[PDB]
Design a protein around this motif. Structure first.
Motif, PDB file in Angstrom:
ATOM      1  N   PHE B  38      27.834  53.183  39.979  1.00 36.76           N
ATOM      2  CA  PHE B  38      28.718  52.812  38.877  1.00 36.76           C
ATOM      3  C   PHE B  38      28.605  51.336  38.517  1.00 36.76           C
ATOM      4  O   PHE B  38      28.864  50.962  37.369  1.00 36.76           O
ATOM      5  CB  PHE B  38      30.170  53.174  39.207  1.00 36.76           C
ATOM      6  N   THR B  39      28.253  50.484  39.489  1.00 35.43           N
ATOM      7  CA  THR B  39      28.053  49.062  39.212  1.00 35.43           C
ATOM      8  C   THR B  39      26.875  48.838  38.269  1.00 35.43           C
ATOM      9  O   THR B  39      26.984  48.092  37.288  1.00 35.43           O
ATOM     10  CB  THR B  39      27.844  48.301  40.523  1.00 35.43           C
ATOM     11  N   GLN B  41      25.489  51.157  36.349  1.00 36.41           N
ATOM     12  CA  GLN B  41      25.763  51.877  35.108  1.00 36.41           C
ATOM     13  C   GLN B  41      26.652  51.067  34.166  1.00 36.41           C
ATOM     14  O   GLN B  41      26.390  51.006  32.960  1.00 36.41           O
ATOM     15  CB  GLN B  41      26.407  53.227  35.424  1.00 36.41           C
ATOM     16  N   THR B  42      27.698  50.436  34.702  1.00 40.19           N
ATOM     17  CA  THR B  42      28.581  49.624  33.870  1.00 40.19           C
ATOM     18  C   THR B  42      27.927  48.312  33.459  1.00 40.19           C
ATOM     19  O   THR B  42      28.261  47.762  32.403  1.00 40.19           O
ATOM     20  CB  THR B  42      29.896  49.357  34.599  1.00 40.19           C
ATOM     21  N   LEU B  43      27.022  47.783  34.290  1.00 37.96           N
ATOM     22  CA  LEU B  43      26.242  46.614  33.897  1.00 37.96           C
ATOM     23  C   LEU B  43      25.320  46.930  32.727  1.00 37.96           C
ATOM     24  O   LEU B  43      25.155  46.105  31.821  1.00 37.96           O
ATOM     25  CB  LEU B  43      25.437  46.091  35.085  1.00 37.96           C
ATOM     26  N   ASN B  44      24.702  48.115  32.742  1.00 39.59           N
ATOM     27  CA  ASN B  44      23.883  48.554  31.615  1.00 39.59           C
ATOM     28  C   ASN B  44      24.729  48.762  30.364  1.00 39.59           C
ATOM     29  O   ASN B  44      24.266  48.494  29.248  1.00 39.59           O
ATOM     30  CB  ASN B  44      23.135  49.837  31.976  1.00 39.59           C
ATOM     31  N   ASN B  45      25.953  49.276  30.531  1.00 35.52           N
ATOM     32  CA  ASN B  45      26.871  49.421  29.405  1.00 35.52           C
ATOM     33  C   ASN B  45      27.254  48.066  28.816  1.00 35.52           C
ATOM     34  O   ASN B  45      27.347  47.920  27.591  1.00 35.52           O
ATOM     35  CB  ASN B  45      28.123  50.182  29.844  1.00 35.52           C
ATOM     36  N   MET B  46      27.503  47.073  29.676  1.00 37.54           N
ATOM     37  CA  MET B  46      27.855  45.735  29.207  1.00 37.54           C
ATOM     38  C   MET B  46      26.687  45.072  28.485  1.00 37.54           C
ATOM     39  O   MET B  46      26.882  44.395  27.468  1.00 37.54           O
ATOM     40  CB  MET B  46      28.315  44.869  30.381  1.00 37.54           C
ATOM     41  N   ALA B  66      30.057  42.461  41.981  1.00 37.35           N
ATOM     42  CA  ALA B  66      30.942  43.353  42.719  1.00 37.35           C
ATOM     43  C   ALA B  66      31.894  44.052  41.762  1.00 37.35           C
ATOM     44  O   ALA B  66      32.512  43.402  40.913  1.00 37.35           O
ATOM     45  CB  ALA B  66      31.737  42.588  43.783  1.00 37.35           C
ATOM     46  N   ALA B  67      32.008  45.371  41.899  1.00 35.85           N
ATOM     47  CA  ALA B  67      32.950  46.145  41.106  1.00 35.85           C
ATOM     48  C   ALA B  67      34.348  46.018  41.696  1.00 35.85           C
ATOM     49  O   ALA B  67      34.527  46.137  42.912  1.00 35.85           O
ATOM     50  CB  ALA B  67      32.527  47.613  41.048  1.00 35.85           C
ATOM     51  N   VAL B  68      35.339  45.756  40.840  1.00 32.38           N
ATOM     52  CA  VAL B  68      36.705  45.490  41.280  1.00 32.38           C
ATOM     53  C   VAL B  68      37.688  46.266  40.416  1.00 32.38           C
ATOM     54  O   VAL B  68      37.375  46.693  39.302  1.00 32.38           O
ATOM     55  CB  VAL B  68      37.069  43.987  41.231  1.00 32.38           C
ATOM     56  N   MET B  69      38.891  46.445  40.951  1.00 39.29           N
ATOM     57  CA  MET B  69      40.030  46.958  40.206  1.00 39.29           C
ATOM     58  C   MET B  69      41.062  45.851  40.041  1.00 39.29           C
ATOM     59  O   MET B  69      41.305  45.075  40.970  1.00 39.29           O
ATOM     60  CB  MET B  69      40.660  48.165  40.904  1.00 39.29           C
ATOM     61  N   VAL B  70      41.666  45.781  38.859  1.00 38.21           N
ATOM     62  CA  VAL B  70      42.603  44.723  38.503  1.00 38.21           C
ATOM     63  C   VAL B  70      43.967  45.353  38.259  1.00 38.21           C
ATOM     64  O   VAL B  70      44.081  46.311  37.486  1.00 38.21           O
ATOM     65  CB  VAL B  70      42.130  43.939  37.263  1.00 38.21           C
ATOM     66  N   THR B  71      44.991  44.819  38.919  1.00 34.94           N
ATOM     67  CA  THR B  71      46.363  45.283  38.766  1.00 34.94           C
ATOM     68  C   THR B  71      47.229  44.150  38.231  1.00 34.94           C
ATOM     69  O   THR B  71      46.996  42.975  38.534  1.00 34.94           O
ATOM     70  CB  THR B  71      46.939  45.792  40.093  1.00 34.94           C
ATOM     71  N   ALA B  72      48.231  44.512  37.434  1.00 33.09           N
ATOM     72  CA  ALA B  72      49.106  43.528  36.817  1.00 33.09           C
ATOM     73  C   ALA B  72      50.479  44.143  36.591  1.00 33.09           C
ATOM     74  O   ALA B  72      50.640  45.364  36.552  1.00 33.09           O
ATOM     75  CB  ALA B  72      48.531  43.017  35.492  1.00 33.09           C
ATOM     76  N   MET B  91      36.351  47.186  45.178  1.00 30.92           N
ATOM     77  CA  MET B  91      36.031  48.563  45.520  1.00 30.92           C
ATOM     78  C   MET B  91      34.545  48.686  45.833  1.00 30.92           C
ATOM     79  O   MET B  91      33.721  47.925  45.319  1.00 30.92           O
ATOM     80  CB  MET B  91      36.401  49.537  44.394  1.00 30.92           C
ATOM     81  N   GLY B  92      34.212  49.648  46.681  1.00 29.06           N
ATOM     82  CA  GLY B  92      32.836  49.867  47.095  1.00 29.06           C
ATOM     83  C   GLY B  92      32.568  49.302  48.485  1.00 29.06           C
ATOM     84  O   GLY B  92      33.326  49.555  49.420  1.00 29.06           O
TER      85      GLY B  92
END
Lengths: 37, 303, 303, 303, 135
Positions: B38-39, B41-46, B66-72, B91-92
């Motif tokens: 997914f890292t 894949q999302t880099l290719n999307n970006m 690094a793939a991360v999740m952000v909470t707020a 994550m990962g």
């Protein structure tokens, strides 16, 4: 004959139209639950 | 000082926001891209959104991403342009997020709509956690939520803890401060207050209410045991009857039975329990058996 | 000094800009081009734009080139020709960006349109991060964003933290400084101020407002625990009741139960907590169990 | 002394120029031509332009040639024949650029048109960077850019930082120096100044404006943390409330809680923070948790 | 895409438990207990994402998100988050209607129930309270 009319096995409409959700109440919650069964 | 420290206003509440993002600029501490697709894949999307079309099939091994999740936390009455703090968690299989930089990240609620955009630098203390960090003023609010505040003539104050006596005290304090029909107690953590119409009048009424002082009535006696952290905390209202206590590897400073006298004050309870000379780990079993025998008077809660 | 340190003006907000670029001039610390094909692909794109058409298929191994992402903050009321600082973070598997030089990089927002062009030299401190750097005045603004400032007669001031009492104090301060109908409180972090028409009148009104002094009312008692960095910070309004504390490997300087008296002042709370003689790591569990028991009065937040 | 150090003139801005070139005369520190085909390809292009037609297919291994990128800053109001400095950065896998010589290099902007020609000798300091260098007066301007300066009667001054109070002070200073309708404040970083027609009158007006002295009003309190370089810089307007601080491996010179008194002056803040006796690495976590608790009053920015 | 393997080291599946307080209103905060399931090692310095909290009626009542505090012998796969969940559904009550209310003793005793009834009768009035059974 093949030209004789005959009802299909699955009768009625074969698809359904989605219904839009209700208007959300303007409270302080982003969470807006629909009416539960 | 007391109303704002014991009650909450109806319609004034926070919310949760979540999003997915990437952290770059790491010093070789990124996750293994061969195991996390997914890292890449999302880099290719970006890159495809930016304008770079990498071919498919070719392998990419990265060490700084690094793939991360952000909470707020969405604050009440939020306006667009305001800033909030965010928490970034890896994550990962990344190693650390030391000196990283978070790219653009949409923050969505449970309605799958965006509310904030997050971008900034991750601060890690540097034992200490290495895959988690916090960014101060890292996100900007971009969608406002309509509220029902200002309309109507009644507003409910919600207590943090349920008590009929505390709700009656709050209602009596508001009644002796403002007027006769100022407030009405609905239930043990809900007090209804009548306010005039208009936003300015309600704001002025809440500013006068929230800084009032109200004596706090004695509460229920309760003993809390946290076995995971090994802590026992008692209350000021805890009393004790007279009983006998037997425990392995314990003796009178010389029989095995130790007598505990009846105690009303908290200091007497502490003195009687310290006369046993037991560890807190043994004290948990002693308190549980004492509550089962009925010699202990407070209610026991295991968190 | 106080209005500018507590509130923000409506329509005055920053934005985020992102872009992709390359860093050259490295001393053999570039990423492995055999594992990152986007570096060689974008280098071929740059050469083809410049006029050099390399053949395809042939391998290229580079040591001085690193692919990076560039982040920037768009200031309010920005004009073309002004300079802003940028943050350069390495992506891929580069070693360090020491003494590098960033080439031309378009900076785009979420609307996929350009707003700034970035080019400059990366400053690395040289432990310290090696794949991240900052360039001062490295980007030039080249697109201006239209604003609604100047029109209308009302302007909203947005508080950083929600409080009815603080908003009432700000409204009363503006009313006693300027006039009767100068300001109106809308909600707990929104105060509406009436201003005359025209840009110069609004600028003069905001210059007089922003340097006003307003006393800060006492806030909610709150205790913040950061377990990742191992820090506990209390507030000036935190009070304590009387309770009993038991904790592993702790004793009175000799029983296991330690008594904490009721405290109103902050210094009394600090003295009572330092009488326990516990580490901050143990103090987190003590404070959590005390808040569960209700002896602690402040609200507990875990960041 | 103050206007020129705080504002910029509209239509007066720099630009970026980039180009590709070769460096010869190296002492065996050139890149591997077997891995970089563009070096040999551009060398063949240069020889074919000069008149030497090398056959294709034959291998060429070079040690004194390095492919480089050249960056330059286009000054405002530039005339042909003037000289500017350039920055030369090595691309590929070259070792060092010590004692090199840059050949002819066209410098093009984003419009893909030439503006300057660069040729000179690279100065390397000779730790120090080896693949980067700077040439003083190494490029000659050869294309002039038309400007709108001289026409019209209004000119905008753009502030470096947005402030309504600073813009009002600048407008009041110009008004008390020149005349009543001399200047008009548009927004927080844009002040419009009325000037007479003609180039000489505008030049004389700008020469009188730019050396004016204007007092600088107090700014927003702000604390900047750079975790990559390990630096924390505070401001003169930063204040502090009273709170309690707990931190791992820290104690009073003997409990774990340390009390910080409320401070207004900057020296009091420095004294109170140095009473904790913490490292700057720990001070970052302390300041972040203090800003989350609200005891810290300045806004926190992580660069 | 499906089929491709994913090996993760920073993610742990957990179960979240909470206690619904009486007379709860939407917007209020409650504490939650987070317990690891599977074969995770520790939850030190973790962060819990969004989690619906449902009762036995399979309907949501609270949303949970926050940071897990572990004491750090001590348990490593269990933690507690203070004010980590927000109530979002209110339960209707029968309180307020009627004219009789029952007090339920913690332990059954005829003598203690008689003492409580006599105390209420001597404090308020003659027909204030009536003992039904031992608790």
């Amino acid at each position: 004959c093949a030209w004789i009319p005959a009802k299909p096995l699955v009768q009625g409409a074969t698809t359904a139209q989605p219904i839009p959700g209700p208007v959300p109440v303007a409270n302080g919650s982003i969470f807006q639950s629909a009416q539960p069964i | 000082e007391r109303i704002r420290d014991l009650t909450s206003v109806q319609g004034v509440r926070e919310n949760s926001l979540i999003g997915y993002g990437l952290v770059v600029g790491l010093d070789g501490t990124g996750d293994q891209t061969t195991q996390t697709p997914f890292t890449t894949q999302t880099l290719n999307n970006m890159l495809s959104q930016l304008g770079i079309t990498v071919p498919t099939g070719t392998n990419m091994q990265l060490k700084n991403v690094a793939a991360v999740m952000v909470t707020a936390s969405y604050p009440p009455f939020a306006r667009q342009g305001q800033t909030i703090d965010v928490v970034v968690s890896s994550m990962g299989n990344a190693k650390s997020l030391r000196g990283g930089t978070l790219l653009m990240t949409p923050l969505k609620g449970v309605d799958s709509q965006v509310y904030a955009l997050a971008q900034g630098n991750i601060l890690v203390g540097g034992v200490n956690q290495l895959n988690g960090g916090r960014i101060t003023n890292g996100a900007i609010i971009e969608r406002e939520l309509p509220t029902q505040f200002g309309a109507g003539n009644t507003i409910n104050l919600q207590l943090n803890d349920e008590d009929f006596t505390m709700a009656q005290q709050i209602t009596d304090a508001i009644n002796r401060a403002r007027g006769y029909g100022s407030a009405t107690a609905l239930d043990a953590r809900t007090v209804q207050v009548r306010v005039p119409s208009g936003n300015s009048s309600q704001v002025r009424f809440l500013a006068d209410i929230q800084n009032m002082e109200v004596n706090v009535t004695p509460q229920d006696a309760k003993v809390v045991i946290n076995s995971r952290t090994g802590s026992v905390v008692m209350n000021r209202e805890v009393t004790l009857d007279s009983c006998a206590v037997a425990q392995g590897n314990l003796s009178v400073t010389g029989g095995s039975l130790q007598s505990v006298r009846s105690s009303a004050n908290l200091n007497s309870v502490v003195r009687a329990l310290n006369a046993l000379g037991a560890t807190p780990m043994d004290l948990m079993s002693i308190l549980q058996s004492m509550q089962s025998a009925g010699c202990l008077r407070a209610k026991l809660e295991i968190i």
